[PDB]
């Protein structure tokens, strides 16, 4: 009969989870105490003894084969994969060497001090039974105070590897000792060790790849893949169990890590369902094992203790703490020299941040039960229970106090000001909406005292010298603007999460150190990982280019392509993100400070960084076309789909569409995105004719396309060639089809790329050229004579006229800076302003008889070229300019040498 | 050894779910076929027989105690509870009598035709083994075509009750037959029947209430309550099993229904996790039982079949179909007379909408195994398998064809036009965003052919006569406007989901029938349920007002309080939603149609409905104060919290606040909402002094409150008393503190309530009174003389002046109609316009020296009283008016008899 015991264990777990939250110590200790109470009752009353004599003394097989795999698999599921793989080498070598040192030193201490007849293998059992740690309570404590999530990942990963190594060592030593009939020669022992080393994780990886490939073919089905994932985990556990008695847990851990790594092939709802399911199973097993071990230790272990044996555990705790501190203190300089060093605070937290959790108690129970009626099992269980019940309270309380007294639990001043601003805004909004609602003719009867009191809110957080402070405050303002620009870019969907995290980390580490802005050296190092051996592998196999090896070649090809493609995508993303952010800062910081040389320094730094990054990115695009084409196509499709989804949501919110149909369209869009995620890694570049067909003002009609193709000429130029200088008429119109081109002319300097037309302005107004063109590489260009351009534009007079298209494009491309300079308050992005200008339409002066009247319907009005006269104010207007909202009567003259153009933005 | 069998069963279920979706017939048939194949292999190869001789021949106890409770409990969990409780009586009586008739007629048919030696009990066995249905495939087919969701609710509920009754009958007859040692006298048989009837569901309800009360005390913990819910279900299953062999399933069903009913005490994430968990378990059980019964029927049942036995199957199918049709055809007129009648389409669908699912196969397996080596078990299993394999294909295909040929697979024309409009808008948005993105200087290299092709979208759906068509189109336009107004009101958070469903149902049933609008009689019947018997029980137990009953009284009082409070809240919500929607519709169709008599009819109908509903709602508020106060306070708190959450989300979207802090504030707001949900059902009304302190222009300053209280007088009036007429100076200002008051004066007519001040306009401009005041009940009023009013207003000259407050309030209350009349395009609500006017501020003419200039910064400008002269246009402006955006220079004069006031709206 067991039912009452497990039911009571679940109830007590719920009670100790609910009622014991405000105390600093974890709930589990309370559970242990409860078990102790039951034990003494089980000693006296025979009925409680009869009801506990079934789970109290349970077979070692079920515990060692069930309670351990669940715990170790849970410790390897909630782990973030990318952060762990960032610093896997450091954490694994640290955990391995720490466990080795701890085991050997605990063994020699057991020989020296414990004055027993313990053998060598018993000493390593007693040493490696407490080296394993299960510090889920550390993560529970540092979920809020652990600002550096890298520290949380490190403290979880080191514990995970320590648990794995401790399980391996204990199992091999138990098999060598408690079943002495087995031979113990090295000849097959080395084979067994290498088998445990390699044959496990390889099998886990193979089955993980197989099951992910199988799951990648199921679309819109949240029921089959749950069953497939659970069966995939169980069968590998079974095979790993028959494989070796130890390799099962390692293979299961590798499977869990690989499943958690992939995200595209599994929908998020299934992922969170599996997370919750596994967490619930882990919690239930954890509660059961604490209560069972408490009952066992109180019932039998305590009656065979001695005063010296009671004194020994304090010395054991001091010894384990001092060796744990010494190993990390000694390895700190080596990891500093390698490049993955630490500091005072991280070393001190790691020194006092280890809690002996559930695995130690499980192994103590197993060895106590296998020992039988001997003093050795009682000593193991008593010592493990004492060490755990001591550390799980002392280290928790002192780690809380130490976090309080040191710099971890501090709040930055900008964060406090941001909280104050948000609280003020919320209070203002609540006040205005309450004031509005009190004026209603239907809700004037509610008792406003409790209505006001219940909805209140509160913040959870409650000269050379002048030049130095102003430059410091300007630097902090610039970094804050850069951070909010990155956040805005992320929200719009033009930038991936990982690139956002990298950029924010770079911004914070640049702001932390004195008077240093964002360094382009670290960024170019970040995307310089393209200079790596996988490319050498690809070159070797392409040079190479027994019967079944043929089909072996492309698949490897594919994964190699994949294995680099993401990397370039990431790099490219960062570059684009950075450059856009920089431009926005260069538009907003201008009117913030009024010290001339400070603006000069800021502008010089920003311009140099912009030019260097754009040059390096253009050269990288020149190096390889296919990956750039694939990344650009994926970005365009993602932006289009995101905007379409936003339009669906807005149209639903207006009530025009019911919720069923909006859900259907959203599901279709999500299916399109999922099919996008499975796109080929690289695509061959388009031919030049497609590039000619893809320009803005030669689309929608083949007549203009082949009319231009009738007389379009192709030219080629090499390095160091000057194509056009200043002080001359616009001979023709260029179009870059390959290479990279530098343009410089009178102060500003820029680098173009493929797909950008050169000198559109020079052919419309016949202005002299104002650009010097040089070539940084080989280049092919398309040349069209201006005479043919004018003949063609005089030939076509349809309503979608080519003249209108070019004037619209040049107007928007010359008017984005004008709006973004002065009218750009907080909350405006390049994308928003570009779309808002896109919604507008150009106006002609034929129907207006050279007279325009400014209404309040049109948002803004600008003049590109020409002169706009006034009558009541009589003011001259130059070109180009944004017309301020003062004059509402714009008259125009007629001039043969110039015809004015004007642009407006209207409402929807 | 079983592992390979269950693993293969799960894998085959996965395949048959994946690669068999385009076919119309359900996947389960395929599974059956697969089992058959394995069976014949198990007949020949001894190894497959050795691997399948374990699960195929399984002990009946585990099947009858595991596979049945899960299967029955799943159908009671995904059920919508409110739709089932709406029409529980009809469905339960129909299911019970249908099962009784089917069982008896199948028994007598087994007597007449089967020419066996079967007794009477075996006849009921064969009759009630196929009466049970598991039509989850019917719901799967009707999830998209069954627009009338009440049909799905009925077809699921009738199946559920049929399954329960069939289980009860089967179990009692099996216990009476296969264990003949048991006594079969009636004396304790009637006791057993009543025990199964009553003792089960009462215990289930008791434990459901206990576990919901326990779960209501846990806040922000998504792990304890999962374990508590699962343990609560299991312990009741265990106790119900020990209680009676039959009552366990009924108790578990009642527990599941009650758990699904409550929603406030359980967070939604836990709810969806339990949904997915139970669905997965049910699917696994279904796959296992199908494959096992296929193996069993192919291996042994088929070898003892005769040609006449093969011929009888068609006759049984025809007989069961005609019986199922005849019973519903005969019960149709009775349900029509009761008030829950049906029509042709529902009767025909119910006639051919029953599929014998997994429960029939389970019961056939149990009786076949208990029969042992006898022909009777083989005959049962063969007949059940044949009936299922026939109906599960024939009825599915014919129900699909019949739905296609009937009007249920039809699309309304307005839905088609809405889809066309949405598709056009999406295509336009995609085109404009692609055109904008092609002008970028960084994404000009992507091959636009695949980019354009991949993101494309397609719609899933591809004289008396003139007066008649015009009134029909006007009526449909009015109903469409009302529907979109209801949707907008629901989105803003001022109206509950259930009231929205009720109002939309009323709208569509009003639109279905010719030339009649929304009826106030049905709505008043909807909120007249407050007159339900409970109120009589409440009055009796208040009049009444052995040792432990003292604590029993208040709990009963409280549960009666809640049981009436929910209904009254629903009624009040429906009333307010309807009245706001009617005002908006009456404001928007001011210029849609241009027929005079049509406008007169529309206005008369709308005004009569508005007046009747507001009068009845005011009288209901007069009847009982406490529930009205509680509902109003809850509504105000909900609106305030929703607006605060919206401000959090907007502030996060602007990048000013990071994600963590926004999540923290959102969690705090959600906790506040959760604590709101546990508010007391009713609260006492505030004293009249609190009402005097709660007005708009006497808040935030105690000095004005006591100054008004110095000379405020109290007056009382009764029914039929006229307080003030027209043609007289404004003697004083009123304030309603109790009762209901009618005001009528020269055409318009209205009823006020408590908290609305009467005649504010008469004391500012000293205008003669234009209202006739009558009393529909007893009334108390607060009277203040105008002399004290003007003395007080001349006394106070602080910047938050009382004069400014009254002018602001009267301005917004007179200016809401002006904006809502002409400027209201699609997408504007009363709340939005009220907030937009609230953000504005009144302007004084002292600093403007009687001269104002209209900019484009201010959105709109209005004039309340006075004359606004012009100079360049020279136009006089009457009062009140909205100034059109033509004149931008507004000059003012000075007059002793009138001082003009002007209102503006500025940007943020
Ligand atoms: C997640 C979804 C849900 C469905 C599913 O996954 C997907 O869930 C999975 C999981 O839940 C599985 C079950 C888990 C538990 C399993 C238990 C297993 O039996 C146990 O198997 C153990 C194996 O070590 C022991 O058996 C002894 O092992 C010794 C070693 C031998 O020596 C000795 O012989 C064996 O057994 C000995 O000799 C006899 C044989 C007796 O068992 C005796 O006792 C025992 O001394 C133990 O003794 C025995 O009991 C049984 O064979 C299959 C089993 C039930 C599994 C069937 C398939 C599943 C349901 C899987 C299924 C797909
Ligand atoms: C959802 C969470 C997870 C944890 C939990 O719920 C919360 O899961 C619940 C559930 O999984 C429970 C288990 C379900 C299966 C149970 C099986 C049961 O043994 C079986 O009990 C049967 C009772 O009819 C039969 O025993 C016969 O009973 C009759 C006698 O006559 C005859 O002799 C016996 O033969 C059968 O013969 C025997 O085998 C055992 O006694 C307890 C048991 C294992 C349960 C222990 C407690 C649980 C684990 C519960 C636990 C709380
Ligand atoms: C809701 C209702 C659900 C009822 C299911 C559980 C209730 C009750 C379970 C009681 C089953 C009795 C069957 C008789 C066993 C027998 O004959 O003994 C055989 C031994 O075989 C076993 O002991 C097998 C037990 C497997 C049960 C696994 C269910 C897990 C569902 C997990 C669900 C967790 C949440 C609940 C040998 O002879």
Query: Quick one: which of B634, B632, B621 has its CA closest to B679?
Result: B634
Residues A739, A743, A746, CA angle at the centre, nearest 5°?
A: 180
- Cα distances from B445 to residues A679, A706, A754, B434, B598, in angstroms, run 18, 21, 7, 14, 60
Q: Shortest CB distance from B633 goes to which of A450, A641, A656?
A: A450
Q: Is A633 on the interface with B (CB under 8 A)?
A: yes
Q: State whether residue A743 is helix, strand or coil.
A: strand
Which residue in chain A has the smallest CA separation from B283?
A223
A737: Cβ below 6 Å to ligand 2? no
If one counts every other C-beta atom within 10 angstroms of the C-beta of residue B897, the result is 6
| φ, ψ dihedrals at A248, nearest 5° | -60, -45
- Judging contacts by C-beta atoms under 8 Å, the chain B residues touching residue A484 are 655-656
B45 touches chain A (CB under 8 A): no
Distance in angstroms (rounded) separating the CA atoms of residues A19 and A16: 6
Ligand 1: distance of its center to the CA of B1 in Å?
8
3-class SS of residue A525: helix
Residue B758 falls in which region: left (phi positive, over 0), alpha (psi -120 to 50) or beta: beta
Q: How far is CA A650 from the centre of its chain?
A: 28
Q: Which residue out of A8, A437, A646, A871 would a mutagenesis test of the B interface target, given it has the greatest number of B Cβ atoms within 10 Å?
A: A437
Distance, CA of B378 to CA of B383 (rounded, Å): 8
Instruction: State which approach was used to obtain the coordinates.
Output: cryo-EM
Of the listed ligands, the closest to the CA of B228 is 2
Say if CB A758 and CB A734 are below 8 A apart.
Answer: yes
- Residue whose C-alpha is closest to residue B329's, from B512, B496, B94: B94
Q: Does A283 touch chain B (CB under 8 A)?
A: yes
C-alpha closest to that of A232 among A208, A248, A203, A196: A208
> How far apart (Å, rounded) are the C-alpha atoms in residues B835 and B364?
67
Cα angle, residue B705 at apex, residues B701 and B707 outer, rounded to 5°: 115
Nearest residue, CB atoms, A283 vs list B223, B668, B686: B223
The closest of A22, A141, A136 to A400, measured between CA atoms, is A141
d(CA A8, CA B443): 64
Which helix (H) or strand (E) element contains residue B791?
helix B786-795
Chain B nearest-CA distance from A144, in A, is 10
Residue B819 · residue B860 · CB < 8 Å: yes
Inter-residue long-range contacts of B63-69, CB under 8 Å, 24+ positions, other chains counted: B63/B362, B63/B365, B63/B366, B64/B362, B64/B366, B65/B241, B67/B285, B67/B288, B67/B289, B67/B362, B68/B167, B68/B249, B68/B359, B68/B362, B69/B237, B69/B248, B69/B249, B69/B252
What does the alpha-carbon distance between residue A336 and residue B105 come to, in Å, rounded to a whole number? 88
Q: Is B738 exposed, middle or buried (0-12, 13-18, 19+ CB in 10 A)?
A: middle
* Chain A interface includes B554 (CB < 8 A): no
**Three-state SS annotation for A422-479:** HHHHHHHHHHHHHHHHHCCCCCCCCCHHHHHHHCCCCCCCCCHHHHHHHHHHHHHHHH
What would you report as the CA-atom Rg of chain B, rounded to the nearest whole angstrom? 36
Q: Which of residues 848-877 of A touch B (CB under 8 A)?
A: 854-857
**Distance from C-alpha of A527 to C-alpha of A67, rounded to nearest angstrom:** 45
What is the gyration radius of the CA atoms in chain A, in angstroms? Answer: 36
Q: Of the candidates A580, A598, A594, A607, which has an alpha carbon nearest to the alpha carbon of residue A481?
A: A580
Burial annotation A660-695 (CB, 10 A radius, 16+ → b, else e)? ebbebbeeebeebeeeeeeeebbbebbeeeebbbbb
Sorted by sequence, the CB contacts under 8 Å of residue A402 that are 6+ apart come out as A348, A349, A352
Closest-CA distance of chain A to residue B451, Å: 6
CA of B5 to the centre of ligand 2 (A): 24
B657/A contact by beta carbon, under 8 A: yes
B280, B418, B644 member nearest A430 (Cβ): B644
User: A148 to chain B nearest CA, in Å?
Assistant: 14
Tell me how close the Cα of B375 comes to any Cα of chain A, in angstroms.
38
Closest CA to A389 of A284, A287, A293: A293
Q: Which long-range contacts (CB under 8 A, 24 or more apart) does A509-513 make?
A: A510/A479, A511/A475, A511/A476, A511/A479
The answer, yes or no, to whether any atom of ligand 2 lies below 6 A from the CB of B238, is no
Distance separating alpha carbons of residues B384 and B296, to the nearest angstrom: 13
Tell me which DSSP letter residue A19 carries.
Answer: T
Task: Return the bridge partners of B773, or none.
Answer: B743
The side-by-side arrangement of strands in the sheet containing A841-843 is A841-843, A901-904, A861-865, A881-882
Q: Tell me the best of B58, B62, B70 to mutate to test the pocket of ligand 3, counting ligand atoms within 8 Å of each CB and taking the most.
A: B62
Between CA B37 and CA B39 the distance in angstroms is 5
Phi/psi for B733 (5° steps) reads -115, 135
Q: At what angle do helices A247-261 and A68-75 cross, to 10 degrees?
A: 30
Peptide bond connecting B880 to the previous residue in cis, omega within 30 degrees of 0? yes
Query: Which ligand gives the minimal distance to the CA of A234?
Result: 1
For residue A524, give every residue at least 6 positions away whose Cβ sits within 8 Å of its Cβ, in sequence order, or none.
A613, A616
Write out B713-730 in H/E/C secondary structure.
EEEEECCCCCCCCCCCCC
- Asked if residues A127 and A110 have their Cβ atoms less than 8 Å apart, the reply is yes
What is the strand order of the sheet A741-744 is part of?
A749-751, A741-744, A772-775
Contact A667/B at CB under 8 A: no
Helix (H, G, I), strand (E, B) or coil at B674: helix
**What's the order of all strands across the beta sheet hosting A779-785?**
A713-717, A779-785, A732-738, A757-758
Phi and psi, residue A176, nearest 5°: -75, -30
Nearby residues of A892 by Cβ (< 8 Å), 6 or more positions away: A845, A850, A851, A852, A866, A867, A868, A869, A900
Strand pairing class (A772-775; A851-853)? unpaired
Q: B451 touching A, CB under 8 A?
A: yes
Q: Do A568 and A530 form a contact (C-beta atoms < 8 A)? A: yes
**CB pair distance less than 8 Å for B433 and A640:** yes
- Given an 8 Å threshold on Cβ–Cβ distance, is A429 in contact with B657? no
Give, for ligand 1, the residue of A234, A235, A277 to mutate: max count of ligand atoms closer than 8 Å to Cβ: A234
Please tell me the distance in Å from A575's CA to the nearest CA on chain B.
11
Asked whether the bond before B226 is cis by omega within 30 degrees of 0, the reply is no
Q: Which of A226, A281, A225, A232 is nearest to A252 (CA)?
A: A232
Residues 6+ apart with CB under 8 A from B201: B250, B251, B254
CA distance A334 to A350: 16
Q: Which residues pair with B881 in a beta bridge?
A: B863
Annotated binding residues of A for 3',5'-cyclic AMP, written as ranges, equal 759, 761-762, 769-770
Q: Which residues of A make up each annotated binding site?
A: 759-762, 769-770
Nearest to A24 by CA among A137, A148, A143: A137
Instruction: Please name the residue of chain A whose CA is at the shortest distance from the CA of residue B750.
Output: A441
Strands (E) in A261-321, as ranges, are none
Q: Of B461, B612, B275, B185, which is closest to residue A273 (Cα–Cα)?
A: B275
Q: Is A849 left (phi over 0), alpha (psi -120 to 50) or beta?
A: left
Tell which atom from ligand 2 comes closest to the C-alpha of B230: 1
Count of CB contacts below 8 A, A vs B? 290
Choosing from B6, B64, B66, B279 the residue with most ligand 3 atoms within 8 A of its CB, the one to mutate for a pocket test is: B66
């Amino acid at each position: 009969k067991v039912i009452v015991f497990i039911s009571g264990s679940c109830l007590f777990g719920a009670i100790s989870r609910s009622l014991f939250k405000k105390l600093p110590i974890p709930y589990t200790v309370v559970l242990l105490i409860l078990g102790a109470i039951l034990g003494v009752v089980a000693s006296n009353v025979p009925l409680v003894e009869e009801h506990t004599r079934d789970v109290a003394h349970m077979d070692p097989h079920v515990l060692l084969q069930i309670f351990l795999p669940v715990l170790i698999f849970e410790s390897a599921f909630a782990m973030d994969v990318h952060t762990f793989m960032r610093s896997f080498s450091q954490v694994c070598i640290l955990a391995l060497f720490g466990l080795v040192v701890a085991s050997v030193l605990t063994a020699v201490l057991a020989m020296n001090l414990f004055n027993y007849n313990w053998n060598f293998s018993e000493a390593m059992m007693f040493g490696a039974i407490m080296s394993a740690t299960d510090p889920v309570a550390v993560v529970a404590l540092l979920k809020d105070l652990g600002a550096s999530k890298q520290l949380g990942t490190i403290i979880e990963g080191e514990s995970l590897l320590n648990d794995g190594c401790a399980i391996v060592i204990f199992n091999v030593f138990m098999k060598m000792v408690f079943f002495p009939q087995l031979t113990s020669t090295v000849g097959q022992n080395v084979l067994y060790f290498l088998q445990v080393a390699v044959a496990g994780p390889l099998w886990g990886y193979a089955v993980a790849k197989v099951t992910v490939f199988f799951l990648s073919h199921i679309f819109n089905d949240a029921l089959v893949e749950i069953t497939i994932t659970l069966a995939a985990t169980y069968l590998t556990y079974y095979i790993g169990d028959i494989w070796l008695e130890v390799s099962g847990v390692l293979a299961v851990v590798v499977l869990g890590l690989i499943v958690n790594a992939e995200k595209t092939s599994i929908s998020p709802e299934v992922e969170v369902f599996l997370h919750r399911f596994w967490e619930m199973l882990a919690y239930l097993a954890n509660t059961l094992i604490f209560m069972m071990v408490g009952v066992v230790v109180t019932q039998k272990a305590l009656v065979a203790v001695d005063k010296m044996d009671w004194f020994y555990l304090i010395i054991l705790y001091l010894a384990i703490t001092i060796i744990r501190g010494m190993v990390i203190s000694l390895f700190s300089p080596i990891l500093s020299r390698i490049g993955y060093g630490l500091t005072w605070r991280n070393a001190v937290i790691m020194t006092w941040g280890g809690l002996r959790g559930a695995v130690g108690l499980a192994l103590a129970l197993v060895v106590e039960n296998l020992a039988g009626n001997d003093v050795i099992g009682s000593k193991f269980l008593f010592h493990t229970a004492g060490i755990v019940v001591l550390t799980l309270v002392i280290n928790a309380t002192t780690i809380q106090t130490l976090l309080r007294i040191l710099g971890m639990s501090d709040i930055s001043i900008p964060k406090r000001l941001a909280m104050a601003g948000a609280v003020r805004r919320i209070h203002e909004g609540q006040n205005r909406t309450l004031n509005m609602l009190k004026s209603d003719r239907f809700l004037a009867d509610a008792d406003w005292d409790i209505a006001t009191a219940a909805c209140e809110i509160s913040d959870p957080y409650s000269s050379p010298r002048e030049f130095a402070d102003m430059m410091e405050e300007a630097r902090l303002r610039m970094l804050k603007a850069e951070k909010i620009s990155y956040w805005k870019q992320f929200e719009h969907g033009m930038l991936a999460r990982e690139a956002l995290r990298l950029l924010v980390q770079h911004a914070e580490v640049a702001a932390d150190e004195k008077d240093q802005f964002i360094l382009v050296d670290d960024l170019k190092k970040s995307w310089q990982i393209k200079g790596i051996y996988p490319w050498l592998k690809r070159k070797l196999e392409d040079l190479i280019s027994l019967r079944l090896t043929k089909a072996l070649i492309p698949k490897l090809i594919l994964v190699v392509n994949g294995k680099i493609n993401n990397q370039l995508s990431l790099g490219y993303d960062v570059g684009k993100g950075y450059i856009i952010g920089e431009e926005e800062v260069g538009k907003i910081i201008d009117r913030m400070v009024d010290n001339k040389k400070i603006l000069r320094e800021l502008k010089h730094i920003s311009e140099t960084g912009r030019l260097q990054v754009v040059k390096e990115l253009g050269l990288l695009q020149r190096e390889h076309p296919g990956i750039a084409v694939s990344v650009k196509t994926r970005q365009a499709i993602r932006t289009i789909l995101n905007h379409s989804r936003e339009t669906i949501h807005e149209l639903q919110g207006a009530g025009l569409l019911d919720e069923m149909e909006a859900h259907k369209l959203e599901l279709t869009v999500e299916i399109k995105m999922k099919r996008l995620m499975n796109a080929p890694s690289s695509i061959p570049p388009p031919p030049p004719e497609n590039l000619l067909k893809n320009v803005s003002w030669l689309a929608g009609d083949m007549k203009l396309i082949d009319f231009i193709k009738a007389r379009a000429s192709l030219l080629h130029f090499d390095y160091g060639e000057v194509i056009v200088r200043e002080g001359d008429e616009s001979d023709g119109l260029f179009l870059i089809v390959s290479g990279l081109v530098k343009l410089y002319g009178k102060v500003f300097e820029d680098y173009l790329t493929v797909g950008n037309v050169i000198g559109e302005m020079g052919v419309l107004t016949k202005k002299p050229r104002n650009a010097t063109v040089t070539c940084e590489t080989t280049v092919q260009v398309y040349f069209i004579t201006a005479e043919d351009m004018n003949i063609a534009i005089d030939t076509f007079t349809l309503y979608p006229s080519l003249e209108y298209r070019l004037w619209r494009v040049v107007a928007i491309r010359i008017a984005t800076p004008l709006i973004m300079e002065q009218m750009a308050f907080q909350g405006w992005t390049q994308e928003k302003v570009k779309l808002h200008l896109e919604r507008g339409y150009l106006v002609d002066l034929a129907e207006s008889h050279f007279q325009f009247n400014i209404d309040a319907t049109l948002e803004d009005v600008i003049l590109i070229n020409g002169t706009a006269y006034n009558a009541h104010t009589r003011e001259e207007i130059r070109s180009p300019c944004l017309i301020s909202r003062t004059v509402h009567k714009l008259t125009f003259q007629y001039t043969a040498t110039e015809e004015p153009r004007l642009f407006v933005v209207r409402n929807a």
